Design a protein around this nucleic acid. Structure first.
Length: 232
DNA sequence: CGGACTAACGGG
DNA sequence: CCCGTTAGTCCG
């Protein structure tokens, strides 16, 4: 039996569906998912409505509610699940890594994976850096582009706390990937980290092989700092 | 390739 | 208001 909070959310979202918007929204995600057609501002309000009426469920039900929402067809339910997980943030710890892994590799796409990785997993590994090597090597070795992207992006927001040796090691392992979502994640994490340490990122990109997309994205801004040499 | 543009979302 | 970003399409 579906949890009453999830049932209430399903009814309320469905009552406000927009088939006209659902079409372009589904196309944007390359038709991997059905959509109700509800964009983020309204989707968060509809969740708010249900929390106001029912109250947020006891923490004992947290993982259950996330999984039930994950199993519903329309993409807005996974987006809502992530909003709900943020509400239970203070209950999440290192013991939830496998739970988060399973979310990464089910109903997988860039929208859900990017919402799980730099935030929830990033925070966990900042608190428990000793656990990185229990997961990152397996992720990289896996057949799964989303675990590979997770390995790249978990340090995205680390700024001065970035483990540079680790970042570059991870990138080195994945630099030959022909997968767009890997090449782009490499570009993104380098571009972001260059905001903290431009010299290190510039040196890396000039001295290590990267896919063209990865390099181009990495230096999107810092090419202004260093210049674009004449090629002849 | 890589630049220009679109549309939505996060946050100064 | 602005800017920076996951994507996305389109054009030499």
């Amino acid at each position: 039996p579906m949890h009453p909070f999830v049932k209430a959310l399903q009814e309320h979202f469905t009552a406000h569906q927009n088939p006209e918007k659902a079409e372009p929204m589904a196309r944007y995600m390359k038709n991997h998912f059905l959509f109700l057609g509800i964009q983020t501002p309204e989707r968060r309000q509809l969740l708010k409505d249900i929390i106001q009426i029912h109250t947020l469920p006891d923490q004992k039900d947290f993982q259950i509610i996330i999984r039930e929402l994950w199993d519903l067809p329309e993409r807005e339910f996974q987006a809502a699940a992530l909003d709900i997980m943020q509400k239970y943030k203070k209950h999440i710890n290192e013991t939830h890594i496998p739970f988060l892994e399973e979310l990464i590799v089910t109903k997988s796409w860039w929208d859900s994976v990017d919402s799980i990785v730099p935030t929830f997993l990033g925070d966990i590994f900042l608190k428990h850096p000793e656990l990185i090597s229990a997961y990152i090597p397996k992720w990289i070795a896996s057949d799964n582009i989303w675990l590979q992207r997770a390995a790249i992006l978990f340090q995205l927001k680390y700024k001065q706390k970035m483990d540079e040796e680790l970042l570059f090691w991870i990138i080195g392992q994945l630099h030959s990937s022909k997968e767009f979502f890997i090449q782009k994640a490499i570009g993104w994490v380098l571009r972001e980290y260059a905001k903290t340490n431009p010299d290190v990122v510039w040196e890396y990109v000039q001295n290590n092989e990267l896919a063209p997309l990865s390099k181009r994205e990495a230096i999107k801004h810092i090419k202004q700092n260093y210049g674009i040499n004449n090629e002849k």
